[PDB]
Structure formats: structure tokens, C-alpha cells
Amino acid sequence: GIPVKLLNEAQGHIVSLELTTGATYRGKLVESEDSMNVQLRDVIATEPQGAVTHMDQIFVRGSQIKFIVVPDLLKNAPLFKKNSSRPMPPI
Amino acid sequence: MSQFIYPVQQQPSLNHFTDPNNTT
């Protein structure tokens, strides 16, 4: 579906995601999956009561995500286009 | 061309007042 594909558009760009525990993480999005598992790199990590640290990589299980904030240019991505026509797929 | 260029200026003709080396 479109939202999971939008998360695939954001690979290599700084995203910020808040987990269900309350933690916030902002870092490059290295890899993402159809399950929403994400791996952030060079990540600045804010714990729920507010302490900030630096992590080299993190793998979060995507079940725990509340939201993800992607770069703002991606509203112009072509998967949002309503009227669109395909080139008649091959065999 | 570009909107930033190095400045260029004329020499002041070297008497004893405009000599930077003068010590007397």
C-alpha cells in the first residue's frame, strides 16, 4: 500500500520516528521493510524522560513505531498521483 | 560572468610618504 511504499522512498534521508515506549530517534534510514522494521544510522536517540545519546546503528521492530517523519519533498513523489497510465505490461 | 570579482586598484606613485618600507 502507499504508506509503506513512502517509507521505502525515504531510504538514505534523515527520518525521525517515535516508538511506542516514548523514545524518539533521528538518523538516516538505511533499510526498511514491508513489515516496517527500520534501521537508522548515525542516530540521535532521545529517551522518554528526555536524555539524548548517540548510537551508531539501531534496528527497531516496526510493530513498536508510532510515527515516522520523512523529508518534506516526498509529497511530490509519483505514488501520490491519482490519474496515471501504464505502458501495457509485458509477458 | 560572476557577480563576485576581486578588487583592483591603482598604485599611489611612490614618494616618501607612500613607501611602506621607509624608516627615516
Partner: protein, 71 residues
Amino acid sequence: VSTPELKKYMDKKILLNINGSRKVAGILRGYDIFLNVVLDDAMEINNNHQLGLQTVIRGNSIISLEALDAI
């Protein structure tokens, strides 16, 4: 469905927070498609008491799994 992408974290020391409070650090030996993970020489960071020679963690209870090594 699809196995998680942890082929780069194998045989490296790793700290993951079980539930919301516990923090377990061990060497990752294997993983499942539910993100079950089995890591040798675990320890529960608080003094911190070792768990056992071989543990498995149900990935229902894992939130995040940052790696305390090179990758």
C-alpha cells in the same frame, strides 16, 4: 513471510531492551522471522547479573536492538 535483515549483526555484541525496562546484552547467534533472537553469554544490565549460557528471546517483547560493536 520475510526474514528480518540481521545478517550483518551476526556474532557481534548487541544491546536490546526487552519489554520497556530490561536491557539484555549478548552475542547474536540466530534470528527468526518473528524477530526471536538467541544470544550467548547474556547479561542483564542494571551489579548486572548474567543470565545463562544460551538464551532465546521472544521478539514480541523486543523493541530495539542497537549494536555495541563494529557492524
